[PDB]
Symmetry: C3
Subunit: 143 residues, 3 copies
């Protein structure tokens, strides 16, 4: 899972970036049943007049979250993850939920490498983990 | 729907960002049959030597548009949206259509949050609107 | 095919961008069997604290590659492309392969414009090429 977060440069502090990354990685560990070490968060900061809504320049307090996750998850965890991201990120950034927009694109696990290895089906992370080299096993377990 | 537009920084003025966003926003309202206030347009400006075509640096006058769209639309609707974006964005920017590249990615409606609420199937926008609180209804009608 | 390569600004030299770009378009030309002139490579450079892994700031030596490719390709082509991009880009950048993460998103050819014309399904590139005006043909042949 890689979350890309797009907002006007300056909207998200470095310490609020840290809080957003911690929250997304945490909600993802809990709603998806996936280990945190798989989670990547990227902040794409945007120029001043680079974001438009309804053909008109956006309010400064607008955030778009694009998430790439593995296909094969239940409908419930997907929608639950969406509602909770909209909810908790809006609170963390002190924004109205109407201005945290979240999209989930689903891609098969075999279409992803992370830590140098093709990723498995969701739910098969223990099996996948037992295939890694022992030194990779113990750096990941520290996270 | 979010159109992300990537081009070499400086190719698209702020005044042409306004024209492109309005053009994209209007085309989407007419070809897809969806309300204007659902449309987000983002401009990702690129570093000087950050764009390559066929393994070599691209000419400055090159634009790539990535659109995230809901699943469930007809083949003809998608093809008209693609062909018209290539043509009309090319004209607005005084470019050859050969250098406006457009990709359309399809995401289910329930994989999207906008205005704090999960999106419906394309074509069910009215019912969705009827679920919103009256005050949110009245700003969306403002757009 | 559009490869977007995201890394902390400064990790990839301009001269390292060219080598990565040339390598991606060459790998794509051999593993997918598609002409070089369709391949676009984009470098998205990130702020100092903009990349997080496992809820924490990433090491500098981390690269994420997002590819949009046409759907319809064999499992074998995809997995070979993924493993070879992860391995050889790691090598070109003098990075650990564990820190070149690759995602491939699949988009049907009819959902793509390049050089102003909708793309055909994979393998049908000769037919598509014979559709172009002679003058566009001889520019693509130069690439």
């Amino acid at each position: 899972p890689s979350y890309a977060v797009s907002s006007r440069a300056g909207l998200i502090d470095q310490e609020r970036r840290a809080a957003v990354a911690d929250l997304l990685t945490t909600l993802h560990r809990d709603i998806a049943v996936a280990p945190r070490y798989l989670v990547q968060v990227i902040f794409n900061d945007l120029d001043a007049g680079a974001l438009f809504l309804a053909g008109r320049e956006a309010p400064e307090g607008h955030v778009w979250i694009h998430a790439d996750i593995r296909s094969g998850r239940t409908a419930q965890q997907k929608t639950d993850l969406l509602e909770q991201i909209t909810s908790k990120v809006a609170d963390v950034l002190e924004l109205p939920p109407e201005h945290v927009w979240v999209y989930v694109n689903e891609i098969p696990g075999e279409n992803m490498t992370e830590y140098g290895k093709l990723l498995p089906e969701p739910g098969k992370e223990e099996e996948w983990f037992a295939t890694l080299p022992q030194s990779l096993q113990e750096e990941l377990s520290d996270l």
